[PDB]
mmCIF file of C-alpha atoms and ligand atoms in Angstrom:
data_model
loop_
_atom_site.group_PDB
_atom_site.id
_atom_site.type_symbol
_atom_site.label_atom_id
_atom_site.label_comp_id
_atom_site.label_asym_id
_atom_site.label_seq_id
_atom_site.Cartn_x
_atom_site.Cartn_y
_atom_site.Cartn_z
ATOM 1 C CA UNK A 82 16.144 -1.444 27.996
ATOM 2 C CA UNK A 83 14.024 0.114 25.050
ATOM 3 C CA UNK A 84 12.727 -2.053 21.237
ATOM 4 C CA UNK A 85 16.149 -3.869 19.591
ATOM 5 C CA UNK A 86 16.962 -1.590 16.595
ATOM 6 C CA UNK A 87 16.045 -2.876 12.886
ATOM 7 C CA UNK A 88 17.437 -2.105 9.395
ATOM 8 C CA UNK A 89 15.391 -3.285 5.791
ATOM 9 C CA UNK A 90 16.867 -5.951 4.320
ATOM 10 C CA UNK A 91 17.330 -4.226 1.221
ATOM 11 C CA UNK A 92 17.795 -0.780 -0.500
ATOM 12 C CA UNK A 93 18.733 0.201 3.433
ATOM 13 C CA UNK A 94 20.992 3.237 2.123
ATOM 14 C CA UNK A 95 19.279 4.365 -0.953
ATOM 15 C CA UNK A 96 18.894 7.367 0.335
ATOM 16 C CA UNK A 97 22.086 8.473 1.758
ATOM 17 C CA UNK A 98 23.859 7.901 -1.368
ATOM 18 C CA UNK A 99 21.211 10.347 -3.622
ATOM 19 C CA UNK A 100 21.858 13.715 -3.410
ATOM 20 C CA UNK A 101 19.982 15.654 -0.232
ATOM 21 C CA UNK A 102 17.352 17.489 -2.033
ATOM 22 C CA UNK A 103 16.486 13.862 -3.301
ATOM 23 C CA UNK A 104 14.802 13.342 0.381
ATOM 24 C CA UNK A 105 14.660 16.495 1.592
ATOM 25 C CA UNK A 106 11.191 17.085 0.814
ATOM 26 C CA UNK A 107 11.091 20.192 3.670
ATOM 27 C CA UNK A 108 13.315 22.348 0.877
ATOM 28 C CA UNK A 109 11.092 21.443 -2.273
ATOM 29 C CA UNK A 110 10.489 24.597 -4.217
ATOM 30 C CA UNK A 111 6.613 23.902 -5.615
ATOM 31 C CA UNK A 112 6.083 24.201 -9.488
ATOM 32 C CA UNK A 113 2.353 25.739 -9.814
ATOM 33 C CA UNK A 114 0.857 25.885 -12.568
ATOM 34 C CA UNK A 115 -2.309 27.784 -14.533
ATOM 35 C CA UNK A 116 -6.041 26.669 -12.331
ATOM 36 C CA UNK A 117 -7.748 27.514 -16.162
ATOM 37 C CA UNK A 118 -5.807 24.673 -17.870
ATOM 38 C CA UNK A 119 -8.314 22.065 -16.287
ATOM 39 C CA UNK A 120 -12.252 22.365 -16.752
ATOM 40 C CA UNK A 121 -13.925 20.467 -13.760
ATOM 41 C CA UNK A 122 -16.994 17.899 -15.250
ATOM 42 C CA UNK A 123 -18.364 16.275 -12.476
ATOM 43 C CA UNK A 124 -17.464 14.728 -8.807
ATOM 44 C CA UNK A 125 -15.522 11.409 -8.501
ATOM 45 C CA UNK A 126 -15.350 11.359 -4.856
ATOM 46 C CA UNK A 127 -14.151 12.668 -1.210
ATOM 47 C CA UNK A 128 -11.051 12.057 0.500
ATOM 48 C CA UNK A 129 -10.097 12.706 3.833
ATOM 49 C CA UNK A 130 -7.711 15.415 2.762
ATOM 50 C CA UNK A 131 -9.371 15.998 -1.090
ATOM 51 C CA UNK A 132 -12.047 16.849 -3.225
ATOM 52 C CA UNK A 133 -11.883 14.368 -6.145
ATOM 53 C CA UNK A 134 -13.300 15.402 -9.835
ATOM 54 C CA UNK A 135 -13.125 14.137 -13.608
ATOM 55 C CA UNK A 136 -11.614 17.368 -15.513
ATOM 56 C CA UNK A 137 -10.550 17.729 -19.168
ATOM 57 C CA UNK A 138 -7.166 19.531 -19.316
ATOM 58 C CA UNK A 139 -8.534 22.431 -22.198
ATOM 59 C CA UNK A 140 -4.815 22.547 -23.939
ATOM 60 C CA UNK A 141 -4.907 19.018 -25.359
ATOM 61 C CA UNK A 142 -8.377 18.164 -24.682
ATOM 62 C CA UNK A 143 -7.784 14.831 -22.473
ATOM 63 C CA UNK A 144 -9.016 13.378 -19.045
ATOM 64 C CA UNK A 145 -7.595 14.101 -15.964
ATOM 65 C CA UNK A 146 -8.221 13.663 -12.414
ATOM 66 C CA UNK A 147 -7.941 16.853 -9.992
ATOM 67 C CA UNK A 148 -7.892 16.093 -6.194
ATOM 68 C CA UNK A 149 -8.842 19.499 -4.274
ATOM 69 C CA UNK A 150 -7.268 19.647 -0.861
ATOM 70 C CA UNK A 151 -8.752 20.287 1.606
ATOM 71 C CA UNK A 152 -6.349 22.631 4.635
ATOM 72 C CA UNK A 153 -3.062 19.879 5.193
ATOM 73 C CA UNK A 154 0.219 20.398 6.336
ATOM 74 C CA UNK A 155 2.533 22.304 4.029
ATOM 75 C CA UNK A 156 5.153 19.943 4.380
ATOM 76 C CA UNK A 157 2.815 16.341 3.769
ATOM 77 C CA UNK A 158 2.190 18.310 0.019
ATOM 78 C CA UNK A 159 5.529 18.860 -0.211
ATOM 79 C CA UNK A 160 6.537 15.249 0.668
ATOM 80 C CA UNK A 161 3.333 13.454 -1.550
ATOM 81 C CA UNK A 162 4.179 16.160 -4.510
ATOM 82 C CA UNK A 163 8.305 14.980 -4.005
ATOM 83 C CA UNK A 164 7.693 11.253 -3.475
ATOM 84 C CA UNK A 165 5.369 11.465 -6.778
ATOM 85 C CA UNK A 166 7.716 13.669 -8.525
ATOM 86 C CA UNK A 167 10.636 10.960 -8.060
ATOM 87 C CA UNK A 168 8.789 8.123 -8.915
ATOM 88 C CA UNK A 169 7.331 9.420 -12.273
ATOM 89 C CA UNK A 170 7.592 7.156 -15.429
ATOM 90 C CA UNK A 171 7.782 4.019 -13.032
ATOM 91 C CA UNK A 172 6.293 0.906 -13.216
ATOM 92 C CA UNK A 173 2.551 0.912 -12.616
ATOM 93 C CA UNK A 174 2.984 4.099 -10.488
ATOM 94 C CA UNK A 175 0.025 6.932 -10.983
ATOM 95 C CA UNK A 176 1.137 9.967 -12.928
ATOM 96 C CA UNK A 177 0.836 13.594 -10.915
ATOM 97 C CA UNK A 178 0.402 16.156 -14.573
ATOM 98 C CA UNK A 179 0.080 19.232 -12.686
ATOM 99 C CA UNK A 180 -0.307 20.873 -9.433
ATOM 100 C CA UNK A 181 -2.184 23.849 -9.432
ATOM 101 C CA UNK A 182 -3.749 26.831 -6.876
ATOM 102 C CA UNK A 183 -7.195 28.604 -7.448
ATOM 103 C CA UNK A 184 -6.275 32.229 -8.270
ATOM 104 C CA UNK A 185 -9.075 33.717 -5.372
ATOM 105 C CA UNK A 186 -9.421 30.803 -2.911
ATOM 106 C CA UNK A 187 -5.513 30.447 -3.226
ATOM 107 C CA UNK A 188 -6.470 26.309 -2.241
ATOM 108 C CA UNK A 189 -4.270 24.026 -3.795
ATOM 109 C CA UNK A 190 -4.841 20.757 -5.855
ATOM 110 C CA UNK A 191 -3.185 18.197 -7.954
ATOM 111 C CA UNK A 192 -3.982 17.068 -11.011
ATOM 112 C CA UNK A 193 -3.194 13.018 -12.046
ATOM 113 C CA UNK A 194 -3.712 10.696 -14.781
ATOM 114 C CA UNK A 195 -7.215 9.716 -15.197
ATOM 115 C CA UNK A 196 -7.954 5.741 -14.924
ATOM 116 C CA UNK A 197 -11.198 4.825 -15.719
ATOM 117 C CA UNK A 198 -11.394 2.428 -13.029
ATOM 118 C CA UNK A 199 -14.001 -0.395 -12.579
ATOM 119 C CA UNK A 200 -15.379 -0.545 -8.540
ATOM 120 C CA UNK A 201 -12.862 -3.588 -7.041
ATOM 121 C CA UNK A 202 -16.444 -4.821 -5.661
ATOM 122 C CA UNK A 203 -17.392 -5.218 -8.793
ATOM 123 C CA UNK A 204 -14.559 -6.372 -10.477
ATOM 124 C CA UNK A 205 -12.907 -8.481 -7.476
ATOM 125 C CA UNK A 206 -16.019 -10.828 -7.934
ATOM 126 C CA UNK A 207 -15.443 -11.776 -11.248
ATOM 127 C CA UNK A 208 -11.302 -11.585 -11.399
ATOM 128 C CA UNK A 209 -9.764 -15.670 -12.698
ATOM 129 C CA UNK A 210 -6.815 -17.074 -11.191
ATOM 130 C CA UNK A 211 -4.798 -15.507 -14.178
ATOM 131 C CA UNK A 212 -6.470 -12.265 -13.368
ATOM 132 C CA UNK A 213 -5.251 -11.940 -9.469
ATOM 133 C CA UNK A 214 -1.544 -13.618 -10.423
ATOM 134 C CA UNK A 215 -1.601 -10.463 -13.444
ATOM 135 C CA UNK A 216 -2.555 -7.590 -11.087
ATOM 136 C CA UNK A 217 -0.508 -8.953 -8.056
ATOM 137 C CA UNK A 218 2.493 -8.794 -10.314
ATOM 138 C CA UNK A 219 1.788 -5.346 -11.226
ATOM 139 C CA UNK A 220 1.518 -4.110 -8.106
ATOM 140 C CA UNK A 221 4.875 -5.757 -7.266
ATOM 141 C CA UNK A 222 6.506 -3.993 -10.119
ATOM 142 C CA UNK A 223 5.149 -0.154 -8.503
ATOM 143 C CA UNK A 224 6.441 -1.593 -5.024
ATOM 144 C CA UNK A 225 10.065 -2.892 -6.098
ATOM 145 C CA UNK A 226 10.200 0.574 -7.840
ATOM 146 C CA UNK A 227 9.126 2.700 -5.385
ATOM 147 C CA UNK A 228 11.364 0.608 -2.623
ATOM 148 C CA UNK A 229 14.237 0.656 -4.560
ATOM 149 C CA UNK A 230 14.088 4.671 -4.968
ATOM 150 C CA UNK A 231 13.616 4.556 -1.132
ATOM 151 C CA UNK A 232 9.979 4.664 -0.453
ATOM 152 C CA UNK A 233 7.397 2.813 1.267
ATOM 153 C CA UNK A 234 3.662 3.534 0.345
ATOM 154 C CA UNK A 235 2.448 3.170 3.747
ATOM 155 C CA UNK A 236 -1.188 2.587 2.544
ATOM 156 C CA UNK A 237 -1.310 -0.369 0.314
ATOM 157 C CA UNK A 238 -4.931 -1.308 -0.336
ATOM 158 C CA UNK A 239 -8.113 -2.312 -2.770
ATOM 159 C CA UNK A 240 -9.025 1.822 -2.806
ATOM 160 C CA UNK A 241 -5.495 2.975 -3.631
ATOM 161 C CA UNK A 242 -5.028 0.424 -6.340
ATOM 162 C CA UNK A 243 -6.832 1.485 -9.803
ATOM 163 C CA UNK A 244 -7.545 -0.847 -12.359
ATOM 164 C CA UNK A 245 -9.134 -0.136 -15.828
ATOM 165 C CA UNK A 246 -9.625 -4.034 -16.918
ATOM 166 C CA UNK A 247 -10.600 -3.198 -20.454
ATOM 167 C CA UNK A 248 -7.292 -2.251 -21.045
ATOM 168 C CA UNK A 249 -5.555 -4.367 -18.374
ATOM 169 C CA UNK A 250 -4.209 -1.114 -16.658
ATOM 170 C CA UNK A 251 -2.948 -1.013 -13.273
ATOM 171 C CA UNK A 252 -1.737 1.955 -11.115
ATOM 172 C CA UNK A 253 -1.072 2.605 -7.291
ATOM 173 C CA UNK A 254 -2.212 5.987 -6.076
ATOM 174 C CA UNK A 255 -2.945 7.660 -2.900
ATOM 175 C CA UNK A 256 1.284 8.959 -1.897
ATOM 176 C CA UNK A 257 0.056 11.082 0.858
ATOM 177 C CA UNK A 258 1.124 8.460 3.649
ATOM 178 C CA UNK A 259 4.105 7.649 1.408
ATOM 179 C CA UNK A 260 7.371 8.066 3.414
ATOM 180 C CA UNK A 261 11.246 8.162 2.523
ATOM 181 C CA UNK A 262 12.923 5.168 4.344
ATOM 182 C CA UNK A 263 16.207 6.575 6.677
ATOM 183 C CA UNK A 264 18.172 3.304 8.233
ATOM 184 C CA UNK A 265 17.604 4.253 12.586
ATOM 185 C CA UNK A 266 13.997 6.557 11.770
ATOM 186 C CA UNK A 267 11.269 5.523 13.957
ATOM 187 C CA UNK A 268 7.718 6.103 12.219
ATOM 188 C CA UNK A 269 4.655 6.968 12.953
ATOM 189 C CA UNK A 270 2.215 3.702 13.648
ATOM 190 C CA UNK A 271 -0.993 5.602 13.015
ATOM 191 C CA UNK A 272 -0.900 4.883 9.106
ATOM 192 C CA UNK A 273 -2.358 2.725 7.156
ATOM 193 C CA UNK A 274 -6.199 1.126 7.300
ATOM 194 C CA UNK A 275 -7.370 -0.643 10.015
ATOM 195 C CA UNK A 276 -7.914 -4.058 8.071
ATOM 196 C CA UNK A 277 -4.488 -4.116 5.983
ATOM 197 C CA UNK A 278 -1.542 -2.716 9.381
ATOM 198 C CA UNK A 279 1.000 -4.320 9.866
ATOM 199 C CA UNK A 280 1.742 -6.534 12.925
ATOM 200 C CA UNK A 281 4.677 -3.705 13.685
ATOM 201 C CA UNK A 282 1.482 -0.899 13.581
ATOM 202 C CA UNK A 283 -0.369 -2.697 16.421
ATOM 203 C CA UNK A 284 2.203 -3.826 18.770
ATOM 204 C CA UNK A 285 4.213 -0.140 18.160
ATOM 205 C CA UNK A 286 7.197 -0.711 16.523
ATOM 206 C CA UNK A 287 8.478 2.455 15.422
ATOM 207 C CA UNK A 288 11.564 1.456 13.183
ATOM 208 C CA UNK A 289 9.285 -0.437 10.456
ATOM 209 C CA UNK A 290 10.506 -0.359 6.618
ATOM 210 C CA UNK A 291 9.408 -0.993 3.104
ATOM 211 C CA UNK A 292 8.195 -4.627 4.236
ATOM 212 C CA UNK A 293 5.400 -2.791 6.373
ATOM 213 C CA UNK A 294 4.046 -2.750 2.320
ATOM 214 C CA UNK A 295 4.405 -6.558 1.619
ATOM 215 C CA UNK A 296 1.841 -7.472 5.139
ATOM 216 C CA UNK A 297 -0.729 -4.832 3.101
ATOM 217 C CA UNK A 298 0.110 -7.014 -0.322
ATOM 218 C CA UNK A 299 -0.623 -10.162 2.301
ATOM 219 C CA UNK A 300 -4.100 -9.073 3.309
ATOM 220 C CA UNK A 301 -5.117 -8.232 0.077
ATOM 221 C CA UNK A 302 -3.442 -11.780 -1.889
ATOM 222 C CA UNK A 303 -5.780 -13.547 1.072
ATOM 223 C CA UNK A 304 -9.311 -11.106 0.401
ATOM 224 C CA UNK A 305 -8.880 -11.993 -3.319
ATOM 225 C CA UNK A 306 -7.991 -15.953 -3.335
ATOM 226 C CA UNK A 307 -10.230 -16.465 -0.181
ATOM 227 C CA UNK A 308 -13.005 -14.291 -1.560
ATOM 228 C CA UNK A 309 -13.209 -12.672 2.340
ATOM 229 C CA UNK A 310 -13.245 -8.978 2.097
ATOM 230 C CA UNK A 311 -11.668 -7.810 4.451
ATOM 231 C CA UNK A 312 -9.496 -11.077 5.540
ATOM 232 C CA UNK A 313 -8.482 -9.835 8.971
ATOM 233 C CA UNK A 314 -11.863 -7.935 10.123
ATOM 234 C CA UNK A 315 -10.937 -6.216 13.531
ATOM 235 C CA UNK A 316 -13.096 -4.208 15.335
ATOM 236 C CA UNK A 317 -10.647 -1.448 16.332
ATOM 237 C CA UNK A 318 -6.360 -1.603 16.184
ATOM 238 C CA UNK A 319 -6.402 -4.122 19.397
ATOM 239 C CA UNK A 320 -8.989 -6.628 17.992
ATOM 240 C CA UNK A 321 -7.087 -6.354 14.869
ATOM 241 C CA UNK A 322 -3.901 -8.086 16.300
ATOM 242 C CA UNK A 323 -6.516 -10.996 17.730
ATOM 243 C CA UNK A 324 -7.795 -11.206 14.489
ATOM 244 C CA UNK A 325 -4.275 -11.958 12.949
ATOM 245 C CA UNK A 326 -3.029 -13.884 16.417
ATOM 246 C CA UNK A 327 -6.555 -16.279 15.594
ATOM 247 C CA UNK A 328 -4.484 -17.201 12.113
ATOM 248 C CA UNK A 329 -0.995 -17.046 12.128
ATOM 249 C CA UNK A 330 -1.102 -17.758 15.971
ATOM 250 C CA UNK A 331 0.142 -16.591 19.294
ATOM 251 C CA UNK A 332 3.065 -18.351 19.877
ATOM 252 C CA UNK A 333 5.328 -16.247 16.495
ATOM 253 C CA UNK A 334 3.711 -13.259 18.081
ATOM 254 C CA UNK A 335 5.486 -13.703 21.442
ATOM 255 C CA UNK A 336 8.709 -14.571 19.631
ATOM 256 C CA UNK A 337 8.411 -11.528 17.554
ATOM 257 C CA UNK A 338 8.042 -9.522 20.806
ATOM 258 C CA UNK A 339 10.540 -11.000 22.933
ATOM 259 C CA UNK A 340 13.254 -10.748 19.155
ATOM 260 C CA UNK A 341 12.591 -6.726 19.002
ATOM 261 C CA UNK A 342 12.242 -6.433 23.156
ATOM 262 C CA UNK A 343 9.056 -5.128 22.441
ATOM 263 C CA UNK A 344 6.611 -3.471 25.570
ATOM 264 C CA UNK A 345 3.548 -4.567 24.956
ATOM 265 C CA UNK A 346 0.186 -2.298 25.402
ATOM 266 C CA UNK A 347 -1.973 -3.523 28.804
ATOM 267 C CA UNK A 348 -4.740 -4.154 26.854
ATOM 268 C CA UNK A 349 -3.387 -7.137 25.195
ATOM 269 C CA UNK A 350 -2.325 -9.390 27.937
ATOM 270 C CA UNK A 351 -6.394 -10.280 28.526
ATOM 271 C CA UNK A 352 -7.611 -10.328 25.010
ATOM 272 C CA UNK A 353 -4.466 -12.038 23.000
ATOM 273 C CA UNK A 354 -4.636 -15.216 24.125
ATOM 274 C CA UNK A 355 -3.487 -18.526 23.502
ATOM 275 C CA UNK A 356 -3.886 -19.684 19.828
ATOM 276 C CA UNK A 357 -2.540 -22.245 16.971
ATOM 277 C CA UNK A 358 -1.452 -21.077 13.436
ATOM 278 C CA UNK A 359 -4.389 -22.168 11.336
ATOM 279 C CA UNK A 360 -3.675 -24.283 8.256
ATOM 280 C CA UNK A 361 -4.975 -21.801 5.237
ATOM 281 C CA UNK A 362 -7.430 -25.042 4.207
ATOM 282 C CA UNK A 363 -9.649 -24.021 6.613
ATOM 283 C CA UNK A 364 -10.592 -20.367 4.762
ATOM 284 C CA UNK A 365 -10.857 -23.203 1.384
ATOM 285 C CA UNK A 366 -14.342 -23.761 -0.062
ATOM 286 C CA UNK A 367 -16.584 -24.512 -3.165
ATOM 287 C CA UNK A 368 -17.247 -20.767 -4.391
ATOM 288 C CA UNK A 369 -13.116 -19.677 -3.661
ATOM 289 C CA UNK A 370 -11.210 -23.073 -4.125
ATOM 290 C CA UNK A 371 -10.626 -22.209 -8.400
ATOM 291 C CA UNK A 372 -8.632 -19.281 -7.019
ATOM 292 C CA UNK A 373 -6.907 -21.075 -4.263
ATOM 293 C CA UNK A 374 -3.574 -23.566 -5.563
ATOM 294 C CA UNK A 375 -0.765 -24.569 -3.383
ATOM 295 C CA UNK A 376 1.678 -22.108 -5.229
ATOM 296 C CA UNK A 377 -1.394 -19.085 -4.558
ATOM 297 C CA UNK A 378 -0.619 -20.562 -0.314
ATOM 298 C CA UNK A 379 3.087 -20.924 -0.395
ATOM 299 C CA UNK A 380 3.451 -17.354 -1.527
ATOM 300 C CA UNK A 381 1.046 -15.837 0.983
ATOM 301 C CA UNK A 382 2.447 -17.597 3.717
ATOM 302 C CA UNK A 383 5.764 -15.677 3.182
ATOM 303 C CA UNK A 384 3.977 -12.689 3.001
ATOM 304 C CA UNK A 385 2.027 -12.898 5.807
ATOM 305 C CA UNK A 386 4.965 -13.092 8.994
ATOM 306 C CA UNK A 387 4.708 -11.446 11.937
ATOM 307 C CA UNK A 388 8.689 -10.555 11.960
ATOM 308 C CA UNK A 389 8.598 -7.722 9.136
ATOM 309 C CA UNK A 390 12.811 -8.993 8.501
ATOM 310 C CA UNK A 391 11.161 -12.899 7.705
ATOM 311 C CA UNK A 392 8.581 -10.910 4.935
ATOM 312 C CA UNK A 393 9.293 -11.920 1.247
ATOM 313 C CA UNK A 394 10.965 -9.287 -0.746
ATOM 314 C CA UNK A 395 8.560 -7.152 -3.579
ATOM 315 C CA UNK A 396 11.510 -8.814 -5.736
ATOM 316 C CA UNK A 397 11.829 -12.202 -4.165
ATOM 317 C CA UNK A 398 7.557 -12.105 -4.345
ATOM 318 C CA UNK A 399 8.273 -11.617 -8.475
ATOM 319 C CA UNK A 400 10.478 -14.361 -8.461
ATOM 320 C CA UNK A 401 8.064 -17.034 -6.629
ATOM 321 C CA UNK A 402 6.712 -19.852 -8.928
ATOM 322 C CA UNK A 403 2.747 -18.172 -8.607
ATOM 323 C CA UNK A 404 3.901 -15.837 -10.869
ATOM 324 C CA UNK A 405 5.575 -18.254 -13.346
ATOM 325 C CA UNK A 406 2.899 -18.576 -15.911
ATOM 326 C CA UNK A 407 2.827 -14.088 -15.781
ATOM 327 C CA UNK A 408 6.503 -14.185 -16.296
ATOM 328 C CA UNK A 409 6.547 -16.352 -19.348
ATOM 329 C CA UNK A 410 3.645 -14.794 -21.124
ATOM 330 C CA UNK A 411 5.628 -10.683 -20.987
ATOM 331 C CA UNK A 412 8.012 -12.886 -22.996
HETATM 332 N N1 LIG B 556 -4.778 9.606 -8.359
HETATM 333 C C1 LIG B 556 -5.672 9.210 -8.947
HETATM 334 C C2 LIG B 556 -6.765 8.713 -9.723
HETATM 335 C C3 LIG B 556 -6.730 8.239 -11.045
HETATM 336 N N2 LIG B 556 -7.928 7.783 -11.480
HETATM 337 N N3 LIG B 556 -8.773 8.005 -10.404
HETATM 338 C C4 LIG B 556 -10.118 7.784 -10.345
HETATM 339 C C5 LIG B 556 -10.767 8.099 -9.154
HETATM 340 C C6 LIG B 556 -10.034 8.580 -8.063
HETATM 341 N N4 LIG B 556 -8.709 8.869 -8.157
HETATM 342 C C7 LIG B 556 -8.103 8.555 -9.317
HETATM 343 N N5 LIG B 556 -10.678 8.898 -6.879
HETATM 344 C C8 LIG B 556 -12.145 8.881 -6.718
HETATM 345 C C9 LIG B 556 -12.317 8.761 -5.206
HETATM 346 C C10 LIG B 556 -11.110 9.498 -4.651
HETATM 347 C C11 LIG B 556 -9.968 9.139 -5.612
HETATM 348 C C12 LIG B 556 -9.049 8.055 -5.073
HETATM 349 O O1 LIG B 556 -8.295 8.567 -3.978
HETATM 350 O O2 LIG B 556 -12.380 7.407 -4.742
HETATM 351 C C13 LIG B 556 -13.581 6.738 -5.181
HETATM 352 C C14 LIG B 556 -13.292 5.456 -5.869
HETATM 353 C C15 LIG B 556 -13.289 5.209 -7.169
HETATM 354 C C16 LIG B 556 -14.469 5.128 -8.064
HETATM 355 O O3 LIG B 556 -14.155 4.512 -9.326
HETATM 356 C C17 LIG B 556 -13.701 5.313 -10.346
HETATM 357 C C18 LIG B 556 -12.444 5.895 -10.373
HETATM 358 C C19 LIG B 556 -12.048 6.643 -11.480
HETATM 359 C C20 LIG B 556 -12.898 6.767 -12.577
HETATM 360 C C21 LIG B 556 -14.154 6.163 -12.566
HETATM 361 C C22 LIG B 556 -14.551 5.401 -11.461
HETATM 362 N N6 LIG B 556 -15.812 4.812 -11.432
HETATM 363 C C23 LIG B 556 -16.602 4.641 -12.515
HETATM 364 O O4 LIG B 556 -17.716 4.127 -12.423
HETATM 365 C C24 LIG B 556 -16.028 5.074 -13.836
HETATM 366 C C25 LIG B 556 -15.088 6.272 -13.748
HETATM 367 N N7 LIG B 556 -10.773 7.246 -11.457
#
């Protein structure tokens, strides 16, 4: 007997009921445009895949970010320059102006709206209460979009998540793990950052959905009102689960096995353990406990489940009373 099947909770058959070239990212003709529209001004970065620079966009003189790429799979462009192209004019949800190809090196890149971000290092440190409830409801409103037209981001993090606090402007970038969710697909595991996977990731649970995104929410919600960057600091993708199984416990680990039938990895029987779930009090103290509130640990506590199917909702996360005083001040 193989893993018990699983189906998301919600927006399951999004994508059956759009029409095929909606999904079928494989088929995507690929708009280029002119190289010379965009004048490169200096290096923002490196990506794994990408060359990141500040450009000015010549036509109408304004800011742009290009992201070179470096040799990728013709089909991951395809799928990042899809997934971007249907969530456009969403919620919080970065911008992709342009995809262009050097005329000699014939190397392709993609050109975004700038956000003049401020380093979450240096920003994270001096964020209020107010300031993590407003940016962890933004971030809700670009994953309740991007779930409801059938994605999961697959890489939800401080580094994909731009913020330009002068102007209180949020945006989650960085689609090239983004996937379309199909009810029955088994993923791939070997997504996401170490520090921010998903119980599902580590223990190799294939059919995962767009609540893989709300564990990444989790970890962050804890860094922020814990000040603990990262909260779960594993050494490699086994440690990682100990980390977790040290907090929320051993004992909702087994059951979340034994629920899905899942065959656990060697490795862990030695270095799991036996351990309690921890009260989150014990991660409370002097230079954090302004940003910590029994509404802040009621809503990370339903974030933070082992069971993906038991995970709050990007919606049902909106609707929780941490939010309350966001909700009533949009009004
Ligand atoms: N899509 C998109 C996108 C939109 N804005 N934006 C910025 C950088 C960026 N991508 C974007 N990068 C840079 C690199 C790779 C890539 C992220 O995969 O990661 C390094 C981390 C960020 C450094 O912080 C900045 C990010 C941006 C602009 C500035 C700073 N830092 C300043 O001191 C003022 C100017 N904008």
């Amino acid at each position: 007997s193989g893993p018990v099947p699983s189906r998301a909770r919600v927006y399951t058959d999004v994508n059956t009921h759009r029409p095929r070239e909606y999904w079928d990212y494989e088929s995507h003709v690929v708009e280029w445009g002119n190289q010379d529209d965009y004048q490169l001004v200096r290096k923002l970065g490196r990506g794994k895949y990408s060359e990141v620079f500040e450009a000015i966009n010549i036509t109408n003189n304004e800011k742009v970010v290009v992201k070179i790429l470096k040799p990728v799979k013709k089909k991951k462009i395809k799928r990042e320059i899809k997934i971007l192209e249907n969530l456009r004019g969403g919620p919080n949800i970065i911008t992709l102006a342009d995809i262009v190809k050097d005329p000699v090196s014939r190397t392709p890149a993609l050109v975004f709206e700038h956000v003049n971000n401020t380093d979450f290092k240096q920003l994270y440190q001096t964020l209020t209460d107010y300031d993590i409830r407003f940016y962890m409801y933004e971030i809700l409103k670009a994953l309740d979009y991007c779930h409801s037209m059938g994605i999961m981001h697959r890489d939800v993090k401080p580094h994909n998540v731009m913020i330009d606090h002068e102007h209180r402007k949020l945006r989650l970038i960085d689609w090239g793990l983004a996937e379309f969710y199909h009810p029955g697909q088994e993923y791939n595991v070997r997504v996401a950052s170490r520090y921010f996977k998903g119980p599902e990731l580590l223990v190799d649970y294939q059919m995962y959905d767009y609540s893989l995104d709300m564990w990444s929410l989790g970890c962050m919600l804890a860094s922020m009102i814990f000040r603990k960057e990262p909260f779960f600091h594993g050494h490699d993708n086994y440690d990682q689960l100990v980390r977790i199984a040290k907090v929320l416990g051993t004992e909702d680990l087994y059951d979340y096995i034994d629920k899905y039938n899942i065959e656990l990895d060697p490795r862990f029987n030695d270095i799991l353990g036996r351990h309690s779930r921890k009260r989150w009090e014990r991660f409370v103290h002097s230079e954090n406990q302004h940003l910590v509130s029994p509404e802040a640990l009621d809503f990370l506590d339903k974030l933070l489940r082992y069971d993906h199917q038991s995970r709050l909702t990007a919606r049902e996360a909106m609707e929780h009373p941490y939010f309350y005083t966001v909700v009533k001040d949009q009004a």
